[PDB]
Amino acid sequence: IITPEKKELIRNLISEYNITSAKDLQEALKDLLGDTIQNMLEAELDEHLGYEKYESTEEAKSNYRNGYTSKTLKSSVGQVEIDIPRDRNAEFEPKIVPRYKRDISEIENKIIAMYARGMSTREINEQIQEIYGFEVSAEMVSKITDKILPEIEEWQKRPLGEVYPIVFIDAIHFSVKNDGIVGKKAVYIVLAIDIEGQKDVIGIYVGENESSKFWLSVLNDLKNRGVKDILILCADALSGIKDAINAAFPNTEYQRCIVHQIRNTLKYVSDKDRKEFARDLKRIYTAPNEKAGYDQMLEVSEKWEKKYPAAMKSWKSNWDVICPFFKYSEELRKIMYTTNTIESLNSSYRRINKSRTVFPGDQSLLKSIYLATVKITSKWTMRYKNWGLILGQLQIMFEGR
Amino acid sequence: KRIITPEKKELIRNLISEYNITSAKDLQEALKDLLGDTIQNMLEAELDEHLGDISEIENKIIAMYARGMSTREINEQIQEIYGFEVSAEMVSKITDKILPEIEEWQKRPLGEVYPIVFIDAIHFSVKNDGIVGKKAVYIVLAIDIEGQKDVIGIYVGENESSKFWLSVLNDLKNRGVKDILILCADALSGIKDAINAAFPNTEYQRCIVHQIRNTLKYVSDKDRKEFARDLKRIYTAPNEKAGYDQMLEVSEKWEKKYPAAMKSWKSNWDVICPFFKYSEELRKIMYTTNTIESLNSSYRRINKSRTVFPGDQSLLKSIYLATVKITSKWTMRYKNWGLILGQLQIMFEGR
DNA sequence: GTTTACACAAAAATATTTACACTGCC
DNA sequence: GGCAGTGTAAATATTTTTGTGTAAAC
């Protein structure tokens, strides 16, 4: 839609600002933005004082005009300089450009959207300086990204649904500086499916733990946010977690997430060229009943006890926790042994934090974690397939709930 | 003072009225919408003005090319800032503007003598006339008589013949060089023959640091720290025979759980022998790698765009842009060069 | 008369360096 | 081995706005 008023404006701009080339056009862009802002500030001053420049009024006024003061603005097309009007008693606050504000490009969110991508503060600084003209340092990037800390708290207090059929807990470890020592801390992401079949990160908790009381606090946080019943909760082997699970969620059948079993048994110690033969490990969870699964587990153990460090022993010891997986239907089995639904998150967090070698504090780590989390969950619109068929049977398994 | 004409004031008023500007974002989006196609068509006409100085928008696009961004990334950024689309043809026509600058940079007059010179290779895939081939770009970095390091040359390498190295050396000598004091390049096919053919008067020995890099080509994560920790003993040795003893020791001690890399050490030991003839400071300036691995790794930090290059000139442009962006702030020279000067003048008096 | 502009400090707000306490990488 | 990075808190450095006295415009 090309309005003839716009064409008249274009011809008038080309004429009055002496545009003879494209470079003339960019310099005219700068000059025109500056002049427009100066005109609108002159209008706002006329509004505040109540009269135009040198206009006589019969009623004497306690405020006279007091010249101008300079300020360099930083806009999208480049750096401009303007002269701001000035009242005598210094009473009026500008409306277009507030006091002391020199960033105009509304670049705030963009900088954040870069930090959420995984961009270094120095990378962001170099990019902004190169492709915008004005300079924004790294500490200012940190100060800009500090602004979503209230948003982070509002997400930490987000009201949750009443019942979540399936919940997974995953840990991702990073190097963070606590009390002046850089140690490995694990962040726990709580991903849950609701009654309709939608995957959504329900919670994020920084570890900073050396106890089981932390797990009870996490479960009480989830229970306070609005949750009443969990049907299936799957977490990794962690300190005092089963007791906390049965303290606030007793009816929840806690089973050990099989993808965590395949990772902790295989990936931690495994020849890279023999690594792929997890296909024989598929035989354990494609079994019809728990007894056939245990028999296939023993067979796979005997065939792979030739080079296993300590995996099949963990299978044997934790078979008590892996047992309830078989009572669920075939589609719930599918929802369980799909490693992509957890591994996707883990790989995305790692690929976004690839450049962040060491974090200076807990809140800095939380910032990136929440940003990557929203950047990932924004794209999740496909709900789990074959649902309703899965729902119809799981609601039979758990009748009242 | 911005003395604004009354017609300009009425024009600003008309702009505010047409776009209903009340905030700064209103003004910026107004200018973006109003003048998008204007800027686009002006630039297209000025680029097509070459048979069918540079501006800020074109400098910004040059920087976008410098950071190795996709054509779609540049398109998105320009559409957001100025408000018009930029085609890949437009990007190519804009970036061809620095080609005369590159011509000037490849014909620069060089100094008479350069104490230390390094040549490094970086390999890429480029498509010429529809054939995708592996081309290695060789960067020639040299330190001058005062102690300042600066990239002397950039050369595309075809099949890595000795004729190519001889041609590179003849280019360097025509640009003004007469004698090199120390030349250290990567172990390459038939480079020493060209070196002693075009600069015979001083026996240059190569691979002061490219050899530790070549042993680290198969750098295995588990065996990195201890292997470079014990390999520091090989090049910090006081004497040549002590160096050979440490070489055999490290070879026998780390041939376990690792292929037979050390053979390259033995066969090329004839070339590594004279390295110890240099003193502690002259060795330090060499084996630190602080400037060569820095250059190639900084190039790689911008190498996010792993695309095949559409021509030699595109690769050459990107390499020149990265090189000049590094050398602009890195032209600062290093200390303690007086002892190194006294040592180079003791070893090679005439220079 | 009346207003407005212009300086040049002092004051107030903002943005940029070390500074760290380490990590990964040939 | 060294060395180039990281995010940001503390410590500065920079820029903007403000008191008012005075020169100039209306």
Residue numbers in the entry:
A (entry chain A): 6 to 406
B (entry chain B): 4 to 55, 108 to 406
Paper text:
The pre‐reaction complex (PRC) is a complex of TnpA with DNA representing the first 26 bp of the R‐TIR with six flanking bp (fR‐TIR26); the pre‐cleaved complex (PCC) is a complex with the first 26 bp of the R‐TIR (R‐TIR26); and strand transfer complex 1 (STC1) is a complex with oligonucleotide R26(j6)L15‐5′rec in which a 6‐bp bridging spacer links two TIRs and is an approximation of the Figure‐eight intermediate. In all three complexes, a single DNA molecule is bound by a dimer of TnpA and they are all remarkably asymmetric. In each structure, the R‐TIR is recognized through an extensive protein–DNA interface in which almost all of the interactions are contributed by one protomer (“A”) with the exception of the transposon tip which is directed toward the catalytic domain (“CD”; residues 165–261 + 325–407) of the second protomer (“B”), suggesting that catalysis occurs in trans.
In the PCC, the 3′‐OH of the transferred strand (TS) points toward the active site, a position consistent with donor TIR binding rather than recipient TIR binding. The most startling difference between the protomers is that the NDB is completely disordered in one protomer (protomer B) and not detectable in the electron density. As SDS–PAGE analysis of dissolved PCC crystals indicated the presence of only full‐length TnpA, the lack of density for NDBB was not due to proteolytic degradation but rather to the spatial constraint resulting from an unusual asymmetric packing of the N‐terminal domains at the dimer interface. The comparison of the active site of PCC to the active site of Hermes when bound to DNA (Hickman et al, 2018) reveals that although the 3′‐OH of the TIR end is in proximity to the catalytic residues, the scissile phosphate that would be present on the TIR end is still displaced from the equivalent position of the scissile phosphate in the Hermes complex by ~ 5 Å (assuming ideal geometry).
